[PDB]
C-alpha cells in the first residue's frame, strides 16, 4: 500500500506558460511504474503518459515526464485552452494500485 | 556490498522474425526436394505464452515461397507461343451417350514446322472451356487476348512432398500442445522444438484434402465472428474418404512445331466416353455434419436452425471444388453435399470437368497448359476440413445459412501453422552478487 | 477503434442487489486483454475495485466477498459483455462506475506488471445513487 | 532438463544449466540456397556480436565471470532473497531494462582502467 | 568485385565453411577452459574401462589414427565429463571468490 | 573524443582511448544492391577474424594492452622513452618499423611456443 | 501540348502505347530563364575566371 501525494493542490496559469506537477510516493519506486492521467470535468478520463517518460499515440509532444527515485514530475509547456482539467499520478508497482489526489489547473 | 556479475546463457527470449529454410529426407518435382538439408521436443513448465494465428508471419513467407517455387520450373522448357491460330472445330461422336455431347470438340488447324516457309495441317481434341467461338464456325483459345500460353513442363511432377521450414541457430520455435486450442489466447502448455512436422502443400478450394486431423472434437476457427466477410475454418476429428476417377484413356500425340520444339496434344480415345466422377460415402457425411453442427451451435445458440446450401456464384475456381489428381486438374460441382436443414450403403457421386488451361494463384498474365496423361486416372483422398462462410441476415430470425467458399490460398496453409511461434534468444544477463575480483 | 458502452443511471434501494453491464466493440478475445473495474466518488479520488485477467477474476482486499465480476467471449450476434454484481450495498455507494480494458498481448509492452496494470481505454461511467 | 528447460524456475535454480544454452548458439543459387546462406551469415554475425561484447569486458571463455563495479542502490533495492528465489529471468530483464546502458558503459571504462593499471605493476 | 558466373558460388562458400570450421572449433575449445592452449591439463580422471594400456606403450608405439580407432566408442562421455567438470570448477571458484 | 579523434595526438595520449576503436571494427534478393550488402558483411567478418587470429597465436587474446617477454633489439630503434611517446605519433612510428615488422611478428610466434607443456606430462 | 495515349495489342499479352490526337492547339515546348540573374551570375563567372587568364 503506497500512498501518493500530488503537488500542488490548486494552481492557475495563463495561455503560454509551463505547469510543473510533482508526485511523491511512500517507498522508492526504482522500476518507474507510474502513470499520468488527465480527466476533464464532466467528461471521461484519458491516459496521457505511461511508464513515466513515454508518450501515447495521439498525445502531442509538448507534454514531458521525468522520474527520479521517489519524485515523478510532469511538465506541460505551451499551455492551451483545452488542457484545463484534473491530473492524476497513479502507481502500479505493488498490489493494489492507488491513485493520487487531484490537481486542477484554472485560467487567470 | 553488492557487485555486478555478467551471466551468459539465460533463458530469455524476445519476439522477432527471420528466414526459414527447407528440410526434407531423400524424375524431378516442382518443389525442390533435393535442395533441402536431410532431417527433439523439450517441454517447458511454469511459463505461459499468448498465441495469435491471425497475425503470423510464417503464412506470408510460405505463400511467397510457394509462388517463387511455382515460377522456377516453367521457365527452361518449351513455351507454346505460336498456338494462337484460327481453329476449325466440329463435334466428336464415337459411341457417346447423353449429357457428354458438347464438352469435347475435334479441332483442325495449320501450324508451322521446322522449316520457315512451310506449313502443316494438324488436328487435335479440345475441351469446351478451352475454346471460344468468334463471329463451319471458327474457334480460338480463351487465354490468348489477355495472357501468354506456355506448356507445363513434361519432366516434373505435381506430387506434394512434406517439407520442414526450419530455423537457424540463435532462434527458437515454440509450440502449444493444447488439444482444444483455437489459435488465439494464452496457452499453458508450451514446448520448444527444432522445427515443425510434415506439411503437404495441397492446393484445393472448399475441401482441405490430405491435411491434419484434430484430437478431441471438431474445431471451428474464425477471426471476426460478428462480420459476414471473414472465412470460417472447420477441422474434423475423423477423415472422410473420397474416391475420384476418370474413365478416359487420353492417348497423347507429339507434334514438332519447330527446331527442338514439341507439342503434346490429345490423340484418339479407345473406349467409351464417360464422365469423370468422385464417389463419397453418404453414411459418414451425415454424422460429420452432425458433429460439425453440434460444435457450431455453441457460437449461435441452442434455438438456431442451420441451413446448408451451395455456392451463389462468381469465378469457376471459387464456386466449384478445384483440385489436382494424377497430374490433371478437376473441377467438381459438389452441389449435392451442402444441401441440408438442421432443426434444434449408398454413395454420392459428383461429376467433375477437366480443364487444360489453368490460371494459378489468381494471376492475370501468366497461363499454363497441362499435357495429357496416358492411362486411367484414379486417386483416393481424405477430407480433413472445410472452408465455410455466412451471409448477412436481418438480425431478427434464427435461421443461418452456410455456404462453401475459398479462392485465397492463405487459409489452406494457416490451418497448419496456427500453433507455432518464432522467438529470438538473448543469452546476456546482469545480476547482483556479493563478490569481488581477484 | 475500440468503443465501450455501459448501462444507464439506475436508482436502487438499500438491501437489494445491483448489476452493471459493459459492452465492448473492437476487441478480439478476453484472453489477450484484461478488464479492470474501478469507480470514482463525487468530490473524492478514484478507487480500484476489481479485475479479470486470463479468465481469473479477482477483487481488492476491501471488496472481498461483496462484488462479483463475470465475462463472456465473442458471440456471432452479441457484443462482448462484462458484468459486475454488487450485493448488500450500503448508504455510501453513490458513485460513477467505469469499465476499462488493457491489452496484455506483448510481454515487453510495459503496460502491465505481474497482474496489476494501467488503463488505456475508458468508458462513460454509470451514476449509482442509493437512498432510503 | 534440456534446451531452455529452466525457463520457469527461479534465478538461483537456472544459473547452473547455463552450458546447455551456450552450445546451441552457433549450429546453383536456387530459392533454398540463398535462404540457407543468409541464415548462416546471420548466425555467424549473431555469434560474433555477442563474442565481441564478451571480449570487451574481459570474459573470454567464462560464464559466471566477476566484475569490479559496485551495484547502485537506485537500480534495484531488493535483497538476495527476493531475487534469486522469487523472480525469474523473464522479469529481471524487464525490471532493470531502463538501466542496462549505464551498466554496459560502466563495464568498459573499469576494464580499461584495470588494464592500464596492470602496466604500472610490472614496470618496477 | 563480386561476380557469380561460375566461380562466385565456389569462392564465397569456401570462406563460409572456413569461418564455420574456425568458429565451431573455437566454441568447442572455449567451453573446456583451454582458450588459447594446446597441452592444457584437466581435472577428470582416466577410467580403466576405456583403455587398459600402460603409459609406456601408447606414447612410443601407437599412432593417432589407431588411438582414434581404439577409443571411438568412449568419445562423447569424455566430452560430457569435461563439460560437467568445467562448470563444477567455475561454480567452485565462484563459491571460493564470494568469501 | 570520438572515433579516430586522437589521430593528431602523441603515442602517450592516444593509447588511453583504445576502447573507442575496439568496438567499431565489426558493426534479400539477387539484385545489384542485394549482393553488395552480403559482400560487405563477408568482408567485415573477414577483416575481423584475420585480425583476431593473430592475437590468438601470441597469447594476447582478449587483451588490448598486452606485453610479452620478447627483448627489444637496439638495432630497430635508437630512441629513448621520451622521444617516442611524447613526440612521435602513431602515423610516424609505423613508417620507421616497416622494415622490421616481420621480424617482430616472427619472434612473437615462438614466444608463446617456448612456453608450452614439456615432459611434466610424462 | 495535350497528348493522349492509345494502346494497340500487338500479340498475346503484349501492348504498345502510342500517341492519339492533340486536343486543342499545337504549340512549342519552351523553357524560361531569368535574364538579370543570369547576367549577375555570368559577371561573377567572368570575375572568377579572370584569376587564371
Ligand atoms: C478459445 O478456447 C478457450 C478455451 O480455454 C476459450 O476460453 C473459455 O472462454 C469462455 C467464455 O465463453 C469461458 O467461460 C466463462 O468462464 C468464466 C470464468 O469465471 C471464473 O470466475 C468465477 C468467479 O470466481 C469467483 O467466485 C467464486 C465463487 O464465489 C470463488 O470461488 C472464486 O474464488 C472467485 O472469487 C474471487 O473473486 C471475488 C470477486 O468476484 C472475491 O470477492 C473473492 O474473494 C475471490 O477473490 C468462477 O466462479 C468460475 O468458476 C467456474 O468455472 C470453472 C472452470 O473450471 C469451474 O471449475 C467452476 O466450477 C465454475 O463453474 C471461473 O473460475 C465464467 O464466469 C463464465 O460464466 C458465465 O457464463 C456461463 C454460461 O457459459 C453462465 O452460466 C454464468 O452465470 C456466467 O454468465 C453470467 O455473465 C454473463 C456475462 O455478463 C451474462 O450474460 C449472464 O447472463 C450471466 O450473468 C448472470 O449471472 C451473474 C452471476 O454470475 C449475475 O450477476 C447477473 O446479474 C446475471 O444474472 C463462463 O463460464 C471459459 O472459462 C474459458 N475457458 C478456459 C478459461 O479454460 C475461449 O473463449 C476460446 N476463444 C474463442 C474465440 O473461441
Ligand atoms: C468485426 O466486424 C465489425 C462489423 O464491421 C467491425 O466494425 C465494428 O462494428 C461495431 C458495430 O456496433 C462498432 O461498434 C460501435 O458501437 C457504438 C455503440 O452503439 C450503440 O450506441 C449508438 C449511439 O451512439 C446506437 O445507435 C447503437 O444502436 C448502439 O446502441 C456506436 O456508437 C458506433 O457507431 C459510431 O460511433 C462513434 C460515434 O459515436 C464513431 O466514432 C464510430 O466510428 C461509429 O461510426 C459503432 O456502431 C465498432 O466500432 C466497429 N469497429 C470499428 C473498428 O469501427 C469490427 O471492427 C470488426 N472487428 C475487428 C476486430 O476488426
Ligand atoms: C461410383 O458409384 C457409381 C454408382 O453409384 C459406380 O457406377 C457403377 O459402376 C459399376 C462398375 O463399373 C457398374 O456396373 C456395370 O454394370 C453393367 C451392366 O450390368 C455391366 O455390364 C458392367 O460389367 C458393370 O458391372 C454400374 O452399373 C455403375 N452404376 C451406375 C449407376 O452407373 C462407379 O463405378 C463408382 N466409382 C468408383 C470409383 O467407385
Ligand atoms: C492425398 O494422398 C494420397 C496418398 O499418397 C494421394 O494418392 C496418390 O496419388 C498419386 C497421384 O496419382 C498416385 O500415384 C500414381 O499411382 C498410379 C497407380 O497406378 C501410378 O500408375 C502412377 O504412375 C502414379 O505413381 C498414388 O498411387 C496415390 N496413392 C495411393 C495410396 O493411392 C492423393 O493423390 C493425395 N491427394 C491429392 C489431392 O494430391
Ligand atoms: C524505459 O524503457 C522503455 C522501453 O525500453 C521506454 O518505453 C518507450 O519510451 C519511448 C520514449 O518516447 C516511447 O516512444 C516508446 O513507445 C516506449 N515503449 C516502447 C515499447 O518502446 C521508457 O520510456 C523508458 N523509461 C524511461 C526512459 O524513463
Ligand atoms: C477429327 O477430324 C479428323 C479430320 O478432320 C479425323 O481424321 C479422319 O478420320 C477418319 C476416320 O477414321 C479417317 O478415315 C481419315 O483418314 C482421317 N483424316 C485424316 C486427315 O487423318 C479424326 O478421326 C477426327 N477425330 C475423331 C476423334 O473423330
Ligand atoms: C490452312 O492453310 C490453307 C492454305 O494453305 C487454307 O486453305 C485456304 O482457306 C481459305 C479460307 O477459306 C480459302 O479461301 C482458300 O481457297 C484455301 N486454299 C488455298 C490454297 O488458299 C486453310 O483454310 C487453312 N486452315 C486450315 C484449318 O486448314
Ligand atoms: C474407395 O476405394 C477403396 C479402395 O481403393 C475402397 O475400399 C475397399 O472397398 C471394398 C468394397 O467395399 C472392400 O471390399 C475393401 O475391403 C476395401 N478396402 C480395400 C483395401 O480394398 C473404398 O470402399 C472406396 N470408397 C468408396 C466410397 O467407394
Ligand atoms: C450443379 O448441381 C446443381 C444441382 O444438381 C445444378 O442445378 C440444377 O441442375 C439440374 C439438373 O438436373 C438442372 O436441370 C437445373 O437447371 C440446375 N439449376 C440451375 C442451373 O439453376 C447445377 O446446374 C450444377 N452445375 C452445373 C455447372 O451443371
Ligand atoms: C486418411 O485417413 C486414414 C485414417 O486415419 C489414414 O490412415 C492412417 O495413416 C497414418 C499415417 O498418416 C498411419 O499411421 C495409420 O496407421 C493409418 N491408419 C489408421 C487406421 O489410422 C490415411 O493415411 C489418410 N490418408 C492420407 C493420404 O494421409
Ligand atoms: C455440335 O454441338 C453443339 C453443342 O452441343 C450443338 O449446339 C450443335 O448443334 C452440334 N452440331 C451438330 C451438327 O451436331
Ligand atoms: C478476352 O476475350 C474474352 C472472350 O471473348 C473476353 O471475355 C475478355 O473480356 C477479353 N479480354 C480483353 C482484355 O479483351
Ligand atoms: C488405352 O489404350 C491402349 C492402347 O493404346 C490399351 O493398351 C489400353 O488397354 C487402354 N486402356 C484402357 C482400355 O483402359
Ligand atoms: C445448449 O445445449 C447443450 C446441450 O448439451 C448444453 O450443454 C448447454 O448448456 C446449452 N446452452 C445453454 C446456454 O444452456
Ligand atoms: C446451387 O443450387 C441451386 C439449386 O439447385 C442451383 O439452381 C444453382 O445453379 C446452384 N449453383 C451452383 C453454382 O451450382
Ligand atoms: C436438396 O435437398 C432437397 C430436400 O431433400 C431435395 O428435394 C433436393 O432434391 C436436393 N437437391 C440435390 C441437388 O440433391
Ligand atoms: C514449477 O513450479 C513448481 C512449484 O511452483 C516447482 O515445484 C517446479 O520445480 C517448477 N518447475 C521447474 C522446471 O522449475
Ligand atoms: C548511483 O546513482 C547516483 C544517482 O544517479 C549517482 O549520483 C552515483 O554516482 C551512482 N553511484 C554508483 C556507485 O554508480
Ligand atoms: C568407470 O567405469 C565404470 C564402469 O562403466 C563406471 O561404473 C564408473 O563410474 C566410471 N568411473 C569414471 C571415473 O569414469
Ligand atoms: C613406422 O612406425 C612403426 C612404429 O609404429 C615402425 O615399426 C616402422 O618401422 C616404421 N616404418 C618405417 C619405414 O620405418
Ligand atoms: C593539436 O596541436 C595542439 C598544439 O597546437 C594541441 O594543443 C592539441 O591537443 C592537438 N590536438 C590533439 C587532438 O591532440
Ligand atoms: C487536356 O486533356 C485533358 C484530358 O487528359 C482534358 O481534361 C483537358 O481539358 C485538356 N485541356 C485542353 C486545354 O484541351
Ligand atoms: C517560375 O515559376 C515560379 C512559380 O512556380 C515563379 O515564381 C518564377 O518567377 C518563375 N520563373 C520564371 C523565370 O518565369
Ligand atoms: C550585365 O551587367 C553589366 C553590369 O553588371 C552590364 O554592363 C551589362 O550590360 C549587363 N548585360 C546585359 C545584357 O544587359
Q: Which of F9, F18, F17, F15 is nearest to F87 (CA)?
A: F9
**Angstroms from D20 CA to nearest CA on chain E:** 10
For residue B52, give how far its alpha carbon lies from the nearest alpha carbon of chain C (Å): 9
Q: What is the 3-state secondary structure (H, E, C) of chain B?
A: CCEEEEEEEEEEEEECCCCCECECCCCCCCCCCCCCECCCEEECCCCCEEEEHHHCCHHHHHHHHHHHHHCCCCCCCCCCHHHCCCEEEEECCCCCCCCCCCCEEEEEEEEECCCCCCEEEEEEEEECCCEEECCCCEEEECCCCCCECCCCCCCCCCCCCCECCECCCCEEEEEECCCCCCCEEEECCEEEECECCCECCCCCCCCCECCCCCCCCCEEEECCCCCCCCCEEEECCCCCCEEEEECCCCCEEEEEEECCEEEEEECCCCCCCCCEEEEEEHHHHHHHHHHHHHHHCCCCCCCCEEEECCCCCCCHHHHCEEEEECCEEEEECCCCCCCEEECCCCEEEEEEEECCCCCCCCCCCECCCCCCCCCCEEEEECECCEEEEECCCCCCCCEEEEEECCCCCHHHHHCCCCCEEEEEEEEEEEEEECCCCC
Rounded to whole angstroms, how far apart are CA atoms F38 and B382? Answer: 45
**Interface residues of chain C, partner chain B, Cβ below 8 Å:** 28-29, 31-32, 54, 74-77, 79, 104-108
Distance in Å, alpha carbon of B170 to nearest chain E alpha carbon: 14
Task: Compute the nearest-CA separation of C104 from chain D (Å).
Answer: 15
> Which of D19, D44, D61 comes nearest E35 by C-beta?
D61
Test C48 with A50 for CB contact under 8 angstroms. Answer: no
Q: Is G15 in CB contact (< 8 Å) with chain B? A: no
Compute, in angstroms, the gap from residue G1 CA to the centroid of ligand 23: 20
Radius of gyration of chain F (CA): 19
**With an 8 Å Cβ cutoff, is F28 touching chain D?**
yes
Residue F19 and residue D112: Cβ atoms within 8 Å? Answer: yes
Is C98:C35 a contact under the CB 8 Å cutoff? no
Q: Does any CB of chain D come closer than 8 Å to the CB of residue E23?
A: yes
Instruction: Identify whether the C-beta of residue B183 lies closer than 8 Å to the C-beta of residue B38.
Output: no
Give the span between the Cα atoms of G21 and F89, in whole angstroms.
75
Question: How far apart (Å, rounded) are the C-alpha atoms in residues C50 and C35?
Answer: 9
Nearest CA to ligand 3 atom 36: B279
Long-range contacts of E25-30 (CB under 8 A, 24+ apart): E27/D23, E27/D26, E27/D47, E30/D60, E30/D61
Peptide bond just before B69 cis, omega within 30 deg = no
Task: Take residue B224 and report the three cell numbers written for it.
Answer: 471476426
| Cβ pairs B/G, distance under 8 A | 13
Contacts of D74 (CB under 8 A, 6+ apart): A30, A69
**F/G touch flag: 3 or more CB pairs below 8 Å:** no
Nearest CA in chain D to E15: D41
Beta bridge partners of B13: B425
Task: Indicate if ligand 18 lies below 6 Å from the C-beta of D72.
Answer: yes
**Ligand 3 center to B25 CA (angstroms):** 41
Ligand 9 atom nearest B335 alpha carbon: 2
Using only C-alpha atoms, chain E has a radius of gyration, in whole angstroms, of: 20
**How far apart, in whole angstroms, are the C-alpha atoms of residue C118 and residue A97?**
9
- Looking at the DSSP bridge assignments, the partners of residue B110 are B121
Strand B276-281 relative to strand B242-246, pairing: antiparallel
Centroid of chain to Cα A19:
11
Closest residue in F to E22 (Cα–Cα):
F49
Alpha carbon distance, N-terminus to C-terminus of chain F: 54
User: How far apart, in whole angstroms, are the C-alpha atoms of residue E95 and residue F11?
Assistant: 42
Cell triple for residue C30?
Answer: 478476453
Q: Which residues contact E14 (CB under 8 A, 6 or more apart)?
A: none
Cβ proximity of D50 and B425 under 8 Å:
no
Nearest to B300 among C77, C106, C107 (CB): C77
Q: Report the alpha-carbon distance of residue A29 to residue A92 in Å, rounded.
A: 10
User: How far does A15 lie from chain C, in Å, by closest CA?
Assistant: 27
Closest CA to B124 of B108, B137, B135, B111: B108
Distances (CA, A) of B242 to B277, B350, B406, G26: 10, 10, 20, 70
- Do C and F have ≥3 inter-chain CB pairs under 8 A? no
Resolution of the experimental structure, in angstroms: 3.7
Classify each residue of B69-90 as buried b or exposed e, where b means 16 or more C-beta atoms within 10 Å of its C-beta.
bbeebbeeebebeebbeebbbe
Cell numbers linked to D3: 534446451
Query: Nearest CA to B432 among E96, D81, C108?
Result: D81
- Locus of grid cell 569456401: E14
The architecture in CATH of the region C3-130 reads Sandwich (2.60)
CA distance B202 to B62: 13
- Residue with grid cell 485560467, as numbered in its chain: A107
CA C131 – CA B427 distance, rounded (Å):
61
DSSP code for A107: E
Distances in Å between the Cα of A58 and the Cα atoms of A82, B98, C22, D81, E55 are 15, 70, 25, 42, 79
Region of residue A24 (phi > 0: left; psi between -120 and 50: alpha; otherwise: beta)? beta
DSSP classification of residue A53: T
Task: Check CB contact under 8 Å for A32 and D98.
Answer: yes
- In which element (H, E) is residue G14 found? strand G14-19
Alpha-carbon distance of B161 to B199, in angstroms, equals: 8
Count Cα atoms within 13 angstroms, Cβ side, for B362. Answer: 9
Ligand sitting nearest the alpha carbon of B307: 16
E99 and chain D in contact, CB less than 8 A: no
Please, do chains D and C touch (3+ CB pairs < 8 Å)? yes
Name which of E23, E24, E94 is nearest D64 (Cβ-Cβ): E94
Q: Counting Cβ atoms within 10 Å, is residue G53 exposed (0-12), middle (13-18) or buried (19+)?
A: exposed
Radius of gyration of chain B (CA): 27
Q: Is A43 on the interface with C (CB under 8 A)?
A: no
E1 in contact with F, Cβ within 8 Å: yes
- Contact criterion met (CB below 8 Å) for F28 and D32: no
Residue A2's CB is within 10 A of a number of other CB atoms, namely: 14
Contact E15, E2 (CB under 8 A): no
User: Quick count: other Cβ atoms within 10 Å of Cβ B198?
Assistant: 14
Select from D98, D99, D102 the residue whose CB has the most chain A CBs within 10 Å, as the one to mutate to test that interface: D98
- Whether residues C75 and B300 touch (CB distance < 8 A) is answered with yes
Which helix (DSSP H) or strand (DSSP E) does residue G8 occupy?
strand G5-11
Residue nearest to atom 22 of ligand 2 (CA): C5
Angle between helix E11-30 and F34-56 (nearest 10)? 40
Residues of chain D with C-beta less than 8 angstroms from the C-beta of A2: none
Q: How far is the CA of B254 from the centre of ligand 13 (A)?
A: 18
Query: What is the number of the ligand 23 atom nearest to the C-alpha of G34?
Result: 13
Q: What is the 3-state secondary structure (H, E, C) of chain C?
A: CCEEEECCCEEECCCCEEEEEEEEECCCCCCCEEEEEEEECCCCCEEEEEEEECCEEEECCCCCCCEEEEECCCECCECCEEEEEEECCCCCCCEEECCEEEECCCCCCCCEECCEECCCECCCCEEEEECC
Beta strands in chain D (DSSP E): 66-70
Decide if A68 contacts A87 (C-beta within 8 A): no
Pairs from B417-420 (Cβ < 8 Å, separation ≥ 24): B417/B53, B417/B56, B417/B58, B417/B59, B417/B62, B417/B196, B417/B199, B418/B53, B418/B56, B418/B181, B418/B183, B418/B221, B419/B51, B419/B53, B419/B175, B419/B176, B419/B181, B419/B183, B420/B58, B420/B173, B420/B174, B420/B175, B420/B196
Q: How far is CA E59 from the centre of its chain?
A: 20
Q: How far, CA to CA in Å, does D42 sit from each of D47, E30, F32?
A: 8, 21, 20
- B191 strand-pairing partners: B43, B175
β-bridge mates for residue B279, sequence order: B243, B349
Q: Residue E61: count other Cβ atoms within 10 Å of its Cβ.
A: 9
Q: Which of residues 89-108 of D touch A (CB under 8 A)?
A: 95-96, 98
Per residue, the 3-state secondary structure of chain F, as one string, reads: CCCCCCCCCCHHHHCCCHHHHCCCCCCCCCCCCHHHHHHHHHHHHHHHHHHHHHHHCCCCCCCCCCCCCCCCCCCCCCCCCCCCCCCCCHHHHHHHCCCCHHHHHHHHHHHCCCCCCCHHHC
Q: Is B210 in the pocket of ligand 10 (CB under 6 A)?
A: yes
- Under DSSP, is residue E86 helix (H, G, I), strand (E, B) or coil? helix
Q: Which residues of A touch C110 (CB under 8 A)?
A: 50-51, 54
D21-35 per-residue burial string, b: 16 or more CB within 10 A, e: under 16 = bbebbbeeeebbebb
Write the residue in B37, B45, B426 that is nearest to D8 by C-beta: B45
D94 CB neighbours in chain C (<8 A) are 107-108, 110
Q: What's the rounded Cα separation, in Å, for the pair F26 and A94?
A: 43
Contact B109, B121 (CB under 8 A): yes
Report which protein residue has its CA nearest ligand 16's atom 2: B339
Q: Where are the domains of chain C?
A: 3-130
Contact B58, B20 (CB under 8 A): yes
Grid cell for residue B334: 459438389
Ligand 2 pocket list (CB less than 6 A): B 224, 226-227; C 1, 3, 5, 25-26, 28
Is residue B255 within 8 A of residue B108, CB to CB? The reply is: no
| Three-class DSSP category at A102 | coil
With a 6 Å cutoff on the Cβ, whether B259 touches ligand 11 is no
Q: Is B98 in the pocket of ligand 11 (CB under 6 A)?
A: no
CATH topology of domain B4-432: HIV Envelope Protein Gp120; Chain G (2.170.40)
Q: Enumerate neighbours of F (3 or more CB pairs within 8 A).
A: D, E
Of D60, F122, F113, residue with least CA distance to E29: D60
Chain A neighbours (≥3 Cβ pairs under 8 A) are C, D
Going along chain A from its start, the domains and CATH numbers come out as 5-107 (2.60.40.10)
CB under 8 A, 24+ apart: contacts of B255-262: B255/B111, B255/B122, B256/B113, B256/B114, B257/B82, B257/B111, B257/B112, B257/B113, B258/B112, B258/B113, B258/B114, B259/B114, B260/B78, B261/B78, B262/B78
Q: Tell me how far the alpha carbon of residue B382 lies from the centroid of ligand 10, in angstroms.
A: 9
How far is the C-alpha of B138 from the C-alpha of B244, rounded, in Å?
34
Amino acid at each position: 500500500d503506497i500512498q501518493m501525494t500530488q503537488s500542488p493542490s490548486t494552481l492557475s496559469a495563463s495561455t503560454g506558460d509551463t505547469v510543473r506537477i510533482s508526485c511523491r510516493a511512500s517507498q522508492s519506486i526504482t522500476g518507474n511504474w507510474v502513470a499520468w492521467y488527465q480527466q476533464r470535468p464532466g467528461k471521461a478520463p484519458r491516459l496521457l503518459i505511461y511508464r513515466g517518460a513515454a508518450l501515447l499515440g495521439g498525445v502531442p509532444s509538448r507534454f514531458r515526464g521525468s522520474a527520479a527515485g521517489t519524485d515523478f514530475t510532469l511538465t506541460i509547456g505551451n499551455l492551451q485552452a483545452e488542457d484545463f482539467g484534473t491530473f492524476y499520478c497513479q502507481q502500479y508497482d505493488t498490489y493494489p494500485g492507488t491513485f493520487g489526489q487531484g490537481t486542477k489547473v484554472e485560467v487567470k | 556490498n553488492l557487485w555486478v556479475t555478467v551471466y551468459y546463457g539465460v533463458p530469455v527470449w524476445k519476439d522477432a522474425e527471420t528466414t526459414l529454410f527447407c528440410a526434407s529426407d531423400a524424375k524431378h518435382n516442382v518443389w525442390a526436394t533435393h535442395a533441402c538439408v536431410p532431417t527433439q521436443e523439450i517441454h517447458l513448465e511454469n511459463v505461459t505464452e499468448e498465441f495469435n494465428m491471425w497475425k503470423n508471419n510464417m503464412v506470408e513467407q510460405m505463400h511467397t515461397d510457394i509462388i517463387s517455387l511455382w515460377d522456377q520450373s516453367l521457365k527452361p522448357c518449351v513455351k507454346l507461343t505460336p498456338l494462337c491460330v484460327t481453329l476449325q472445330c466440329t463435334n466428336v461422336t464415337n459411341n457417346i451417350t447423353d449429357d457428354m455431347r458438347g464438352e469435347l470438340k475435334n479441332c483442325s488447324f495449320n501450324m508451322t514446322t521446322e522449316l520457315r516457309d512451310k506449313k502443316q495441317k494438324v488436328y487435335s481434341l479440345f475441351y469446351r472451356l478451352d475454346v471460344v467461338q468468334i463471329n463451319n464456325k471458327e474457334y480460338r483459345l480463351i487465354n490468348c487476348n489477355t495472357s501468354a500460353i506456355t506448356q507445363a513442363c513434361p519432366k516434373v511432377s505435381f506430387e506434394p512432398i512434406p517439407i520442414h521450414y526450419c530455423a537457424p541457430a540463435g532462434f527458437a520455435i515454440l509450440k502449444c500442445k493444447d488439444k482444444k486450442f483455437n489459435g488465439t489466447g494464452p496457452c499453458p502448455s508450451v514446448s520448444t522444438v527444432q522445427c515443425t512436422h510434415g506439411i503437404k502443400p495441397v492446393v484445393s478450394t472448399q475441401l482441405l484434402l490430405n491435411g491434419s486431423l484434430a484430437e478431441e472434437e471438431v474445431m471451428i476457427r474464425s477471426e471476426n465472428i460478428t462480420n459476414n466477410a471473414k472465412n470460417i475454418l472447420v477441422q474434423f476429428n475423423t477423415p472422410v474418404q473420397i474416391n475420384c476417377t476418370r474413365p478416359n484413356n487420353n492417348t497423347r500425340k507429339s507434334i514438332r512445331i519447330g527446331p527442338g520444339q514439341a507439342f503434346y496434344a490429345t490423340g484418339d480415345i479407345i473406349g467409351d466416353i464417360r464422365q469423370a466422377h468422385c464417389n463419397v460415402s453418404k453414411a459418414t457425411w451425415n454424422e460429420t455434419l452432425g458433429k460439425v453442427v453440434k460444435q457450431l451451435r455453441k457460437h449461435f445458440g441452442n434455438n438456431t436452425i442451420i441451413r446448408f446450401a451451395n455456392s451463389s456464384g462468381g469465378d469457376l475456381e471459387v464456386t466449384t471444388h478445384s483440385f489436382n489428381c494424377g497430374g490433371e486438374f478437376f473441377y467438381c460441382n459438389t452441389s449435392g453435399l451442402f444441401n441440408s436443414t438442421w432443426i434444434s450403403n449408398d454413395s454420392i457421386t459428383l461429376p467433375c470437368r477437366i480443364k487444360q488451361i489453368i490460371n494459378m494463384w489468381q494471376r492475370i498474365g501468366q497461363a499454363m497448359y497441362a499435357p495429357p496423361i496416358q492411362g486411367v486416372i484414379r486417386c483416393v483422398s481424405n477430407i480433413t476440413g472445410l472452408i465455410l462462410t455466412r451471409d448477412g441476415g436481418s438480425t431478427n430470425s434464427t435461421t443461418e445459412t452456410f455456404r462453401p467458399g475459398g479462392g485465397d490460398m492463405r487459409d489452406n496453409w494457416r490451418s497448419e501453422l496456427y500453433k507455432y511461434k518464432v522467438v529470438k534468444i538473448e543469452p546476456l544477463g546482469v545480476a547482483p552478487t556479493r563478490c569481488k575480483r581477484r | 477503434q475500440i468503443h465501450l458502452v455501459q448501462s444507464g443511471t439506475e436508482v436502487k434501494k438499500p438491501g437489494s442487489s445491483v448489476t452493471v453491464s459493459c459492452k465492448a466493440y473492437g476487441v478480439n478475445t478476453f484472453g489477450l486483454y484484461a478488464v479492470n473495474w474501478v469507480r470514482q466518488a463525487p468530490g473524492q479520488s478514484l478507487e480500484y475495485i476489481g479485475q479479470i485477467w486470463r479468465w481469473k477474476s479477482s477483487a481488492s482486499h476491501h471488496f472481498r466477498g461483496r462484488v462479483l465480476i463475470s465475462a463472456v467471449d465473442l458471440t456471432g450476434s452479441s457484443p462482448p459483455i462484462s458484468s459486475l454484481e454488487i450485493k448488500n450495498l450500503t448508504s455510501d455507494d453513490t458513485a460513477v462506475y467505469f469499465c476499462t480494458t488493457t491489452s496484455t498481448y506483448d510481454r515487453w509492452s510495459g503496460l502491465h506488471h505481474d497482474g496489476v496494470m494501467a488503463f488505456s481505454s475508458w468508458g462513460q461511467g454509470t451514476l449509482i445513487s442509493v437512498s432510503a | 532438463l534440456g534446451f531452455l528447460g529452466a525457463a520457469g524456475s527461479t534465478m538461483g535454480a537456472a544459473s547452473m544449466t547455463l552450458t546447455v544454452q551456450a552450445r546451441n548458439l552457433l549450429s546453383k543459387l536456387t530459392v533454398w540456397g540463398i535462404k540457407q546462406l543468409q541464415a548462416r551469415v546471420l548466425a555467424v554475425e549473431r555469434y560474433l556480436r555477442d563474442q565481441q561484447l564478451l571480449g570487451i569486458w574481459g570474459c573470454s571463455g567464462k560464464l559466471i565471470c566477476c566484475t569490479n563495479v559496485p551495484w547502485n542502490s537506485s537500480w534495484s533495492n531488493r535483497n538476495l532473497s527476493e531475487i534469486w528465489d522469487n523472480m525469474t529471468w523473464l522479469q529481471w530483464d524487464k525490471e532493470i531494462s531502463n538501466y542496462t546502458q549505464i551498466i554496459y558503459g560502466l563495464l568498459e571504462e573499469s576494464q580499461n582502467q584495470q588494464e592500464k593499471n596492470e602496466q604500472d605493476l610490472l614496470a618496477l
